[PDB]
Design a protein around this ligand. Structure first.
Ligand code: HEM
Ligand code: HEM
Lengths: 256, 255
């Protein structure tokens, strides 16, 4: 009722990555998504499949495709495709990114950089060396996003190839998994106090979602309402240990 | 060798026919990935997440907002596909792709279609907003693939007529409550049944889904995870009969 307007005022103000930096960063941390192609076998229809991928240094998704797969034959007959990424694949209100582009076979000089980028995200994918597997790269044309579907907070927009490639991946997001886990399972009481302090909302619960150099996001519950809150750090975190120090300081501040 | 012992059991175990399995999984699914032709970016396909509900013929019903990108895609070109993953995070699971043509629902059909959708999305009050409409994807062809990166690889396709003629398994609707109550309160009962019927000593056995002929489990031995089909000694007739059959299979397991 009145808190849903208090949330809006906090969300509009809290420090966060710029839109293009957020999309570049979420894409770089994702490893799987839904590929849309033109169906080669069912002429006139599009087609979807689940694929693993890894962004190369430029942010271009790298795919390891079997010559036996339906989507591979699709891509060889028509390279124009799209890749749909969901930050939380079952969060109906999450960020959703669609990257449209053109699948191209990776050149021989690029095989080594591409193999390492892919294995960095899929360390047990020994099959990438099999003869029937090749690496393909989706060269972006446009990257579109939508977030907060079925909520008051809806954001959307698109970035050109040049805008997306020029953005830097946030160097702190890579530490997201260990920090959020250790905090959600052992210090969930600290998270709510910090959230309580900085948004003035008494939160029944608060689970850390993701993390970047400017702060972290949480899923919070009050009454029969669940919603997301941005928790900015008092200053930009410079490395992993710095993330830990900043949370301690923010906890200390709430005990005052 | 286990990976040959399990395979022999999987090849024999009673299970739904392929078309009945796909018809049943699709009818139990409520969300998926919609591929359309992009209206704004000519020549490219486009993807988005949608909620849906199958109507009685198995046709996915969508409630789409006129504000949404995929709606504008569908209004310019109704050809689309809907990708469903039975276990959305299992990379080796069954994956179903239904290709077809999205069509506006008639005024005579609004009420039946609205109820089929709300049966799967009971709190979706927004379907009554003015900018929302029901669309139905009329299937052309339904394709499936299962077991990517496993020994068990299955694939095939079904025409519209073949898919529509198949019946949804009437026992699968009870899968969620039955599997839950068994997984957290009687996982030891499940392990005895699986061991008895496959002779595999399993560290664990987790029920995944259920149908009138039996249920599937995720099982572990050593550092290996795999799926095993556990058929009933006979077809189950209703929910209580599912309970009745599981007791008997456990009783048999003591011996
Ligand atoms: C309680 C409030 C709201 C609810 C329950 C709600 C519900 C939904 C749902 C279910 C969809 C999915 C439509 C589809 O898949 O076709 C949607 C999409 C959308 N909504 Fe809302 N909505 C709410 C508030 C808002 C507000 C406040 C705005 C704008 C100020 C908005 C703008 C949009 C847009 C642009 C989309 C389309 C996104 C796309 O292209 O896929 N909504 N909403
Ligand atoms: C006789 C043995 C096998 C057969 C007949 C087979 C069959 C297939 C088929 C038909 C596909 C196409 C997927 C699609 O159409 O979307 C595929 C893809 C794939 N297979 Fe196999 N498979 C076998 C063994 C294996 C094994 C043992 C592994 C891993 C240990 C494996 C890993 C994969 C992967 C990762 C993909 C996905 C590649 C892509 O998405 O392009 N395969 N396989």
């Amino acid at each position: 009722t009145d808190v849903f307007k208090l949330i809006q005022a906090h969300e509009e103000k809290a420090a966060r990555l710029s839109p293009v930096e957020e999309i570049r960063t979420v894409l770089n941390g994702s490893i799987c998504g839904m590929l849309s192609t033109f169906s080669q076998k069912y002429e006139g229809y599009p087609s979807g499949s689940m694929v693993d991928f890894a962004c190369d240094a430029d942010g271009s998704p790298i795919l390891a495709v079997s010559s036996l797969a339906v989507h591979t034959k699709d891509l060889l007959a028509n390279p124009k495709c799209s890749l749909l990424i969901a930050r939380d694949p079952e969060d109906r209100t999450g960020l959703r990114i669609t990257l449209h582009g053109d699948a191209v076979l990776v050149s021989e000089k690029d095989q080594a950089a591409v193999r390492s980028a892919y294995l960095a995200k899929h360390p047990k994918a020994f099959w990438v060396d099999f003869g029937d597997f090749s690496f393909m790269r989706i060269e972006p044309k446009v990257v579109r996003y939508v977030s907060g579907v079925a909520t008051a907070f809806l954001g959307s927009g698109e970035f050109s190839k040049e805008e997306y490639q020029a953005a830097k991946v946030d160097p702190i997001a890579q530490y997201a998994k260990p920090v959020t886990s250790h905090m959600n399972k052992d210090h969930e009481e600290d998270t709510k106090a910090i959230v309580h302090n900085i948004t003035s909302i008494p939160v029944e619960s608060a689970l850390m979602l993701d993390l970047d150099s400017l702060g972290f996001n949480v899923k919070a519950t009050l009454q029969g309402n669940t919603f997301k809150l941005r928790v900015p750090f008092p200053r930009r975190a410079q490395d992993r240990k710095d993330v830990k120090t900043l949370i301690v300081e923010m906890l200390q501040a709430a005990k005052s």
